Enzyme design. Structure first.
Site, mmCIF file in Angstrom:
data_model
loop_
_atom_site.group_PDB
_atom_site.id
_atom_site.type_symbol
_atom_site.label_atom_id
_atom_site.label_comp_id
_atom_site.label_asym_id
_atom_site.label_seq_id
_atom_site.Cartn_x
_atom_site.Cartn_y
_atom_site.Cartn_z
ATOM 1 N N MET A 381 0.952 -1.257 0.112
ATOM 2 C CA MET A 381 0.093 0.101 -0.155
ATOM 3 C C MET A 381 0.772 1.350 0.016
ATOM 4 O O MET A 381 1.901 1.386 0.646
ATOM 5 C CB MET A 381 -0.965 -0.139 1.256
ATOM 6 C CG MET A 381 -1.841 1.214 1.352
ATOM 7 S SD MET A 381 -2.879 1.222 -0.085
ATOM 8 C CE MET A 381 -3.667 -0.201 -0.376
ATOM 9 N N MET A 409 0.033 -1.553 5.375
ATOM 10 C CA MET A 409 1.025 -1.401 4.988
ATOM 11 C C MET A 409 1.855 -2.758 5.280
ATOM 12 O O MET A 409 1.529 -3.177 6.329
ATOM 13 C CB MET A 409 1.797 -0.485 5.268
ATOM 14 C CG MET A 409 1.556 1.050 5.171
ATOM 15 S SD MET A 409 2.136 2.082 6.280
ATOM 16 C CE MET A 409 4.189 1.370 6.160
ATOM 17 N N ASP A 434 9.138 2.449 0.329
ATOM 18 C CA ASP A 434 9.823 2.221 1.361
ATOM 19 C C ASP A 434 9.498 2.089 2.933
ATOM 20 O O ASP A 434 9.969 1.538 3.835
ATOM 21 C CB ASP A 434 11.082 3.283 1.303
ATOM 22 C CG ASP A 434 10.610 4.755 0.900
ATOM 23 O OD1 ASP A 434 9.394 4.741 1.014
ATOM 24 O OD2 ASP A 434 11.495 5.434 0.514
ATOM 25 N N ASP A 461 11.401 6.723 -2.035
ATOM 26 C CA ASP A 461 11.281 8.116 -2.209
ATOM 27 C C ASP A 461 11.667 8.727 -0.845
ATOM 28 O O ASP A 461 11.472 10.011 -0.870
ATOM 29 C CB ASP A 461 9.684 8.555 -2.382
ATOM 30 C CG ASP A 461 8.952 8.172 -1.215
ATOM 31 O OD1 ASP A 461 7.876 9.183 -0.994
ATOM 32 O OD2 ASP A 461 8.893 6.992 -0.548
ATOM 33 N N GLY A 463 10.033 8.815 2.110
ATOM 34 C CA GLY A 463 8.974 9.225 2.774
ATOM 35 C C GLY A 463 7.689 8.308 2.491
ATOM 36 O O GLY A 463 7.722 7.374 2.003
HETATM 37 C C1 LIG Z 1 0.008 0.113 9.029
HETATM 38 C C2 LIG Z 1 -0.326 1.473 8.339
HETATM 39 N N1 LIG Z 1 -0.058 2.610 9.205
HETATM 40 C C3 LIG Z 1 -0.344 3.817 8.400
HETATM 41 C C4 LIG Z 1 -0.807 3.902 6.954
HETATM 42 C C5 LIG Z 1 -1.258 5.207 6.245
HETATM 43 N N2 LIG Z 1 -0.677 5.080 5.128
HETATM 44 C C6 LIG Z 1 -1.304 4.710 3.750
HETATM 45 C C7 LIG Z 1 -2.962 4.536 3.453
HETATM 46 O O1 LIG Z 1 -3.254 3.927 2.553
HETATM 47 C C8 LIG Z 1 -3.543 6.136 3.408
HETATM 48 F F1 LIG Z 1 -3.921 6.797 4.468
HETATM 49 S S1 LIG Z 1 -0.277 4.361 2.565
HETATM 50 C C9 LIG Z 1 1.128 4.537 3.403
HETATM 51 C C10 LIG Z 1 2.640 4.393 3.164
HETATM 52 C C11 LIG Z 1 3.423 5.363 2.192
HETATM 53 O O2 LIG Z 1 4.734 4.830 2.377
HETATM 54 P P1 LIG Z 1 5.268 3.847 1.404
HETATM 55 O O3 LIG Z 1 5.408 2.614 1.748
HETATM 56 O O4 LIG Z 1 6.939 4.523 1.418
HETATM 57 O O5 LIG Z 1 4.932 4.371 -0.044
HETATM 58 P P2 LIG Z 1 4.856 5.454 -0.934
HETATM 59 O O6 LIG Z 1 3.729 6.168 -1.166
HETATM 60 O O7 LIG Z 1 6.032 6.444 -0.486
HETATM 61 O O8 LIG Z 1 5.245 5.195 -2.278
HETATM 62 C C12 LIG Z 1 0.832 4.853 4.847
HETATM 63 C C13 LIG Z 1 1.777 5.182 6.072
HETATM 64 C C14 LIG Z 1 -1.189 2.641 6.541
HETATM 65 N N3 LIG Z 1 -1.671 2.365 5.130
HETATM 66 N N4 LIG Z 1 -0.950 1.377 7.217
HETATM 67 MG MG LIG Z 2 8.005 5.953 0.326
#
Ligand SMILES: Cc1ncc(C[n+]2c([C@H](O)CF)sc(CCOP(=O)(O)OP(=O)(O)O)c2C)c(N)n1
Ligand SMILES: [Mg+2]
Ligand SMILES: Cc1ncc(C[n+]2csc(CCOP(=O)(O)OP(=O)(O)O)c2C)c(N)n1
Ligand SMILES: Cc1ncc(C[n+]2csc(CCOP(=O)(O)OP(=O)(O)O)c2C)c(N)n1
Ligand SMILES: [Mg+2]
Ligand SMILES: [Mg+2]
Ligand SMILES: [Mg+2]
Ligand SMILES: [Mg+2]
Ligand SMILES: [Mg+2]
Lengths: 541, 557, 557
Positions: A381, A409, A434, A461, A463
């Protein structure tokens, strides 16, 4: 045969064998170690993981593919509570999982209330307090996990119950017939009269037992199809000319326009939780519900016709009774023609040379090059999830694990490890950001130890981009979304896996091909330029 | 034209002035003909909106009995009876009744008032999380927190109560939600699903088992009693000629008048024809049965092959792990099974002997009256046109023991939770469904006084209910077990009452049997009253220890 | 010699033949003098073991009233009243009563039977998770699953009910645990903790606030009524001369006879002396008070400095966020505060005027009787030697409105959950504690019939209880609000009864007031009866709308 068992654990293991369990994932501890010990004397393979959360994710992959529950095995207290997110993810996606968790001795429960903690995120949660019921409880957990619309089940096993002796016996493991002939005729008549019918596919339409019958019904009827993300793999653009995309995420889908236009909607294997009916059900179409369960009615989902039974037998009977192929209405043809142009525009054929860091669509192209019909793809995700979801029409994978309603995630790598164990002669590609990567990356040791043929891609990225993009849109400033860099190549290699880092665009495709040729775990870090993400995020509901 | 249409003149989308009006319109769509309850401030707009409806308001005198009356309505009509109560103690007074409905499979929807949403968390109201309190005793319990969901939740509560295996459902209605405006439409009610029969290969498997069995028996449960299964059940019994026994929840699924190989009921005794045939069986085929109806450890010897036929898979417990499950539409499955039976069963000598023994029944001037004398006199006044309702206590065991010689086609006796006080409210509910028929309700003096406040409701309704009290001045069913275990009594004796005068103070007709000879003429006179009447019958329970040795004693709560 | 000693001859460690015997021995150590309930098979060994004890078994006729009676015992003695019931509906019939006790802060322990541990999970018993059902309406709810824990759990239930802010506690007792052997000893009961007063710096802070205030007032809650606080409260009031008002839960913490600046009660009306002084206050000092007793939005204008004195920190909600908290032993805190007050309060002119207005009370031959005529006649028969208990309904408001002119020192009226049926059972419980004194209980006809089955219990006990029914043939308190909101009535009218004959059918003495002139002589005659009596009083409720405009209407459920 009612046998006398020296240890409850032995009856547990024998029941697992009757359930076709090939592996157990988890982490041992004192309260549960007799079950681990009993597994040494069985055909069931013991797979230690490094965080219990990922035992639940791996088990879910096993359950989704085989249709028989994957099994997690953990000890009391933190071993159990570390499962909760994973069990909620399995339950939300319909993956059959049985988690067996240790518990304190019954006499000490008087002096964690795991059942209360798991009840909100499972189909079934129970503690074995009467040793005479041990095998019944385990069987009931598999039945709850596997039957109907599948889901997760939790069984708490007190230490003294599995350590002490018991009296009992193992219990052996389609349970419905096709919908009635009169109901088949009723639906067939509606199809014969409809000018703009459409199939809305949900989870159960994507089950393997239904693929042949679904294909026969589509081939016979030639009725357009759209799908929830739970059913993202049931049908795809490359195998059905009247596919209208997945609905639930993007605001410009042919499936939605056809649902709005429809005078007849036939939902197959669908529950409203998969795609809020307020988003698509105008109420102007006759609504047919076909599933393994009665409809979960709500104010925007009150079917006119409700068929419950074996989906394959039902769709086969229905196909046998459809008189002619659909001739698309002019509006329906235009919608689908509109989608063809939409797909061409998304392909960006002419804007095809790129820049660095990598443009998301360049990474998607490189992924689609290495993921063929023999390769399984799992998707974590994050912002990359939206990119891959947008281009599902041009992926041609054996199977795609992407549906994620809880938006959890860290799922991709454990999902891939579980999927690989089911068919280890094949390759699995997992993709995450990441952020998601580091929530489950401890299982890279498990993957090295299993020699799992998994290739993990990281869109890098530094972030939490998917959150940042929303913060920028709402507030024009970022908070809590940036973190520091890592040497992901060296990180992967410290586990004994192959590491790769994309330092240039031109190296992207050769690097991924080089990573795919590794016979075992490999990790590829891919710097991404998410500057253009607002363009894609504007395509969302 | 579609069910969900926003342009249906029969179910228009409206800007309702009060959510209560939408609730009442939804109740009309569910076929509700009356509501039982007690008003209060938080719920009074629903009571008010019912004035503008065809639905009748029936005030009761204790909320528990609104749940009991609703259960009778649900069982008889197949559509949920409705209780309507206010917040706080109005709701908590329902809990025993909702548990009793859920355990028996009677469809009941309770609508309970609640404080305004903004006030829910205030400490004054901390001891009335009603959803948490009702969750353990219902199939469905929910609070409406969004006005837009009002009709959906009420509709879903009826669907939970009525479909699948029926049971009870609770809806909490915050005062501000029912008093304030809402936008929406009624949800038209759906029927049962068009459900496949069991798979054909499984049905053939069971047909082969039937062909090989020497002592097969059908065990009917709750769902066998549903009208949609009646023709199919009859046809299977006629084709197979296999004997049949019924749990008490199976109600009148089968009667001796129509099927000569009906063995009677099971669920209480250990020595009747149904129990002996279950003990003898090499094949037991359960239809519409769940272990909730009758603990399988009591009847399943483990020596027979076990087939489960129901709309739901089995929940496997100790002594109920079926060998074959036939999951799907019961009627469809039974119709398919009947087609695959090649010959009628030739009964074994033992099975034929068991049924012959049940056919024999040879059909006492002491005062107080002997239980058998009371049973025999009741059998005279209860004819096929009369509904009979039965409370809990020792008299229940006597009546159950000779249920085969009652010719009432409508009997409410099944009571697995063993709730006292049910009989009079069940009778009032049953009468309201068919007011052209007499109802006879029977209780002990303990159960009588737990619901006798509804005698005022009966008088006010002019309900044609005759209530009989077996009077011993104690809690006899408890006393028998105390005497057997401890040879002394504790907490089971109380004082006498003038029940004739008690009943008359309500404006009902009262009678008291003062000699054995007076029993039958008193019953006839009370039966001829056109309206509520109560008859007190002094009973001599000396022989009860002899009857209880014929019982599964561990089931008594 | 130590409390936990295993060699104490007064609390020996024993191999008990039955866990029930250890339960009963534990009840004796808690000071229990009687148990209220209804037996059944699962619990009957506890009833049996009580035969060998000094504890009296009191069978009731509906379990709800065992909880009500227990609450009266708990409130009066400070040690928990005890209800004893069987599994299933025996337990679920307690829930309203347990919620009522918990909300009022009355210590009550309910012991409920349960199925054998091995049978808990069987589907027959799936609708009776009693711990889950009681958790929302109790301070403490637990099931004994280990026999070794039997005494510990019963002891802990009494400690939860009695200590801190009192409330109700439930213990589920599986049949096999109480019937089988256990090894253990009784746990001697502990007193209240030796708890520090509030910190000295905080107390000085509040003393300075007192010195600066022009319109201070004390607001007394539940814990101010505990006997351990009596001397300290009196001394603080005498030293400070600060006015005082009491919630209904504060009971007789202070009476007008002892303190000239007592403003009466608050909790229902919006216009009485206590309400006006709270509105005027620049400093409100709450003692032993929790928002559960009286919603702070009704009385806290937010303009006064707010001090919280209690054994527990405040739970801050809307309109109750204290500026200073004095947490600790209430008596110790009040004693320290009294030491730091330098002078008596000189009342403001407005405050003195408010209290003068309350001192003035000028102390109607229509039939049916005017409420004020009934109140005045009741004040004649209720003297300081008489306990008064009051049910819920419109009559409750009349009695509360003139509570200042009742000279009963023991009044049970507080009822935040507004539970009907409480008055007669409260009166029976109170009488059992002090059988040498008369109790007068008062209800409407709706509340009467929810608990009138206990008239048999009263006759059997020879309880010296006089019950008065205000008779309107309806649920008037609900009707008034329906008329005000909708100008029409729904669900609030029922039929008449002959309550004189009703009472006599129990063997109680019955009376019916048939003219205004007959009211006072009838009350005197019923009062002179030595045993249970019931008086029906027809009431004309025409004027009630005028009284309800003086109420916080949003509190009515
Ligand atoms: C367990 C949990 N906690 C919070 C979150 C909050 N969160 C996402 C939700 O879908 C949106 F509220 S996605 C995400 C991760 C973004 O970090 P990356 O993996 O690096 O992917 P990128 O977009 O940079 O390519 C988050 C944090 C989560 N999903 N799941
Ligand atoms: Mg990222
Ligand atoms: C609400 C409730 N409380 C307790 C019990 C336990 N119980 C079962 S039968 C019975 C006696 C009923 O007395 P009565 O109605 O007079 O019938 P009797 O046996 O005396 O004829 C009791 C107390 C119960 N079943 N239900
Ligand atoms: C158990 C319960 N149900 C409903 C209510 C709502 N309610 C509050 S006062 C009242 C009327 C009580 O009628 P009655 O006892 O006759 O007193 P009246 O007002 O007529 O004098 C009702 C129904 C309640 N408080 N308690
Ligand atoms: Mg759950
Ligand atoms: Mg429930
Ligand atoms: Mg009796
Ligand atoms: Mg609690
Ligand atoms: Mg009244």
């Amino acid at each position: 045969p009612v046998r006398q068992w020296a240890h409850g654990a032995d009856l547990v293991v024998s029941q697992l064998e009757a359930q076709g369990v090939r592996q157990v994932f988890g982490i041992p501890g004192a309260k549960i170690d007799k079950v681990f010990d009993s597994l040494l004397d069985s055909s069931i393979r013991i797979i230690p993981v490094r965080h219990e959360a990922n035992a639940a994710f791996m088990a879910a992959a096993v359950g989704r593919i085989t249709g028989k529950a994957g099994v997690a095995l953990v000890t009391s207290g933190p071993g159990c509570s570390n499962l909760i997110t994973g069990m909620a993810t399995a339950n939300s996606e319909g993956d059959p999982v049985v988690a067996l968790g240790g518990a304190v001795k019954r006499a000490d429960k008087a002096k964690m209330d795991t059942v209360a903690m798991f009840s909100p995120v499972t189909k079934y949660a129970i503690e074995v307090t009467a040793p005479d019921a041990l095998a019944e409880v385990v069987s009931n957990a598999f039945r709850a996990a596997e039957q109907g619309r599948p889901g997760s089940a939790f069984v708490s096993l007190p230490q003294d119950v599995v350590d002490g002796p018991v009296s009992g016996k193992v219990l052996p493991a389609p349970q419905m017939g096709a919908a009635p002939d009169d109901a088949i005729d009723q639906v067939a008549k509606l199809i014969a009269q409809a000018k703009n019918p459409i199939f809305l596919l949900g989870l159960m339409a994507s089950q393997p037992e239904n693929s042949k019958a679904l294909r026969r019904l589509l081939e016979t009827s030639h009725i357009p199809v759209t799908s929830t993300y739970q059913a993202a793999g049931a049908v795809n653009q490359d195998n059905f000319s009247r596919f209208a995309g997945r609905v639930g995420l993007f605001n410009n889908q042919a499936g939605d326009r056809l649902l709005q236009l429809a005078d007849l909607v036939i939902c197959i294997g669908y529950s409203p939780v998969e795609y809020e009916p307020a988003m698509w059900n105008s109420g102007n179409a006759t609504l047919v519900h076909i599933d393994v369960l009665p409809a979960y009615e709500e104010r925007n989902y009150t079917p006119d016709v409700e068929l419950v039974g074996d989906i394959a037998g039902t769709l086969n009977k229905l196909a046998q009774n459809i008189d002619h192929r659909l001739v698309l209405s002019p509006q329906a043809a235009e919608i689908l023609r509109d989608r063809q142009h939409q797909r061409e525009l998304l392909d960006r054929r002419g804007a095809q040379l790129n820049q660095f860091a990598l443009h998301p669509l360049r990474i998607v192209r490189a992924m689609q090059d290495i993921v063929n019909s023999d390769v399984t793809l799992t998707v974590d995700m994050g912002s990359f999830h939206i990119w891959i979801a947008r281009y599902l029409y041009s992926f041609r994978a054996r199977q795609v694990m992407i549906s994620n309603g809880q938006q959890t995630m860290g799922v991709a790598l454990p999902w891939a490890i579980g999927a690989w164990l089911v068919n280890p002669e094949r390759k699995v590609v997992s993709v995450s950001g990441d952020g998601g990567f580091l929530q489950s990356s401890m299982e890279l040791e498990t993957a090295v130890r299993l020699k799992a043929n998994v290739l993990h891609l990281i869109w890098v990225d530094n972030g939490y981009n998917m959150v940042a993009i929303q913060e920028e849109k709402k507030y024009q400033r970022l908070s809590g979304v940036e973190f520091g860099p890592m040497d992901f190549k060296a990180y992967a290699e410290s586990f004994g896996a192959k590491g790769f880092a994309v330092e240039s665009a031109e190296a992207l495709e050769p690097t991924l091909r080089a990573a795919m040729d590794v016979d075992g775990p490999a990790v590829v870090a891919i710097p991404v330029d998410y500057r253009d993400n607002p363009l894609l995020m504007g395509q969302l509901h």
